[PDB]
Amino acid sequence: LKIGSHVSMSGKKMLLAASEEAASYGANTFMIYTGAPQNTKRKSIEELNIEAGRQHMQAHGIEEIVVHAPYIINIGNTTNLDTFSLGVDFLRAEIERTEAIGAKQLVLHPGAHVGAGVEAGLRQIIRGLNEVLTREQNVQIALETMAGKGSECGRTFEELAYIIDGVAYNDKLSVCFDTCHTHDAGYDIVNDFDGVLEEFDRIIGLGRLKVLHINDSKNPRGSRKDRHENIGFGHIGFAALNYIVHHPQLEDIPKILETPYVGEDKNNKKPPYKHEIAMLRAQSFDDQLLEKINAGAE
Ligand SMILES: C[As](C)(=O)[O-]
Ligand SMILES: [Fe+3]
Ligand SMILES: [Fe+3]
Ligand SMILES: [Zn+2]
């Protein structure tokens, strides 16, 4: 099973640090943004230290990398035309960076209507994707299932299907399924994950599911809040999350944790990934996981 987490793509080491971080958590896959997750400021390809990173990955059993576009990209914006056009330009460049890094999937929050309404937002996202995609690219944009917080589009499978249907080179589109987002959007992944996966297959198609984000949620089903929670400490729970991670239909899909760092105070936060990955591999919930992370225990 391919299980990992988001890791930082930063500093002078860039991809090498990302791989070192992933290996330190016992991950065999990882997800990175191509720079700061909250902005479009980026380094050149040469500065990404890709060959050092890939050599380290090979030496540590890391077989697949996923890339995520900055969360500020908004090709659903119909109000600020610079936001839209800059998003389009950035994504074209991001696909080239992703191809250079050797990842096949570039995760993208579809877009947000920011007040123009879902219908308008969906039309705009289709326009943006049609301006971005080339027939030659060897990367797929994995549209992420969203929680529906704010003005997010992509809260339902039908919204994603509508976008996909409007894109010419839609063979370049895939989907990233996030457990916190789908639960928050209203899908019953706690009691009927198979039903949600079947609904996904019927509306979008499992052939397009290329990345999984494994997160518990701080809120009830349908809350539309998007506040991730450590594995088994939220409203989704260990049993459901573990079931998804080991699902017979999702064996070849990378599973990426994006759970919150652990710590009572803001100035002392530690990654939970090593412990969460081991817990999921053991298939046994550990009620003292947060205690252990907040002390350095195993
Ligand atoms: C798009 As996210 C990092 O809230 O799963
Ligand atoms: Fe995301
Ligand atoms: Fe996510
Ligand atoms: Zn989220």
Q: Read off φ and ψ for residue 189, nearest 5 degrees.
A: -80, -10
Q: Whose CA is nearest to atom 2 of ligand 1?
A: 258
Question: What's the gap in Å between 213 CA and the centre of ligand 2?
Answer: 8
**For residue 103, which of 178, 35, 31 has the smallest C-alpha distance?**
31
CA 195-213-159 angle, 5° bins: 60
How wide is the angle at C-alpha 220 spanned by C-alphas 259 and 161, nearest 5°? 80
Between CA 80 and CA 74 the distance in angstroms is 10
Closest atom, ligand 1, to C-alpha of 71: 1
Ligand 1 closest atom vs CA 146: 1
87-122 burial by CB neighbour count: b if 16+ within 10 A, else e? bbebbeebbebbbebebbbbbbbbbbbbebebebbb
Residue 260 near residue 272, CB atoms below 8 Å: yes
Ligand nearest to the Cα of 181, by number: 4
Instruction: Report which of 37, 125, 137, 32 is spatially closest to residue 93, judged by C-alpha positions.
Output: 137
CA nearest 221: which of 255, 262, 245, 187? 187
How many whole angstroms from 146 Cα to the centroid of ligand 2? Answer: 8
Instruction: Give yes or no for residue 183 CB within 6 A of ligand 1.
Output: no
What is the Å distance from ligand 4's center to 161 Cα?
20
Q: What is the 3-state secondary structure (H, E, C) of 182-209?
A: HHHHCCCHHHHHHHHHHHHHHHCCHHHE
- What angle (nearest 5°) sits at the alpha carbon of residue 273, between those of residues 263 and 25? 125
Among 213, 214, 219, the mutation site with the greatest number of ligand 1 atoms within 8 A of its Cβ is 213
Q: Is the CB of 159 within 6 Å of ligand 1?
A: no
Distance of alpha carbon 251 from its chain centroid, rounded? 17
181 is in an annotated binding site: yes
To the question of whether residue 246 is assigned a binding role by annotation, the answer is no
DSSP string, 204-269: T-GGGEEEEEE-EESS-TT-----EE-TTSSSS-HHHHHHHHT-TT-TTS-EEE-PPPB-SSTT--
Dist CA 23 CA 52 (whole Å): 14
Domain coordinates in residue numbering, the chain: 1-298
Binding site annotation covers 264?
no
CB distance 109 to ligand 1 below 6 Å: yes
Resolution limit in angstroms? 1.6
CB 284 within 8 A of CB 231: no
Chain breaks in the chain (C to N over 2.5 A) after: none
Q: What CATH architecture does domain 1-298 belong to?
A: Alpha-Beta Barrel (3.20)
Beta bridge partners of residue 275, listed in sequence order: none
By what method was this entry solved?
X-ray
Dihedral sign, Cα of residue 95, residue 97, residue 100, residue 101:
negative
Task: Return d(Cα 143, Cα 128) in angstroms, integer.
Answer: 13
User: Which residue has the least CA distance to atom 3 on ligand 1?
Assistant: 258
Residue whose tokens read 């500093």 = 11
CA 34 to centroid of ligand 1, rounded, Å? 15
**What's the Rg (C-alpha) of the chain?**
18
Measured CA distances, 241 to 93, 120, 216, 278 (Å): 34, 34, 7, 14
